Amino acid sequence: APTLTARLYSLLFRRTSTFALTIAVGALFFERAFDQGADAIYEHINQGKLWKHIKHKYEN
């Protein structure tokens, strides 16, 4: 009964080509996810100050 990690190795990490493709796709998705999450964190920490948080009052 292979574990998750062994499964990951035998599926994607064994040959460098699949490794690199995994790295690229993970890179794209991680970039998206980290950007979203960090932006959420920064906005929450600075909630009420950012122009995006107050533009509605002065817009329209």
Partner: protein, 120 residues
């Protein structure tokens, strides 16, 4: 020689990886023929034949007949060789023993790195 260890290790690991990744039919036929000749030539004379009988009974539980060996050899193809070599030789940690002027022998990290190809 003391100054040729690194080169020979590089070539040996290169051959291992070449068999693992891009073995060809012709060399497979050569290997099968060599194996057939070794099997038939070794089992010549009462002493080697008796040795094979005893060792085969102890290990295989049966003396595999030469015809069975020939059939199993004939089943071998380039795909089979690549599969088995990838299973046993590729990205596997090796065991190394050195004796004498072995300073040029690559450090174990380099030896393990040689066991896989970044191209493949």
């Amino acid at each position: 020689d003391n100054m040729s260890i690194d080169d020979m290790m590089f070539f040996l690991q290169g051959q291992w990886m070449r068999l693992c990744t891009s073995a060809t039919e012709s060399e497979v036929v050569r290997g099968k023929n060599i194996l057939r000749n070794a099997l038939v030539s070794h089992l010549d004379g009462t002493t080697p034949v008796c040795e094979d009988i005893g060792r085969s009974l102890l290990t295989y539980g049966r003396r595999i007949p030469l015809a069975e060996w020939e059939s199993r050899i004939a089943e071998v193809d380039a795909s089979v060789v690549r599969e088995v070599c990838s299973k046993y030789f590729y990205d596997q940690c090796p065991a190394v023993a050195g004796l004498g002027p072995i300073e040029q022998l690559p450090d174990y990290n380099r030896i393990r790195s040689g066991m896989f190809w970044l191209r493949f």
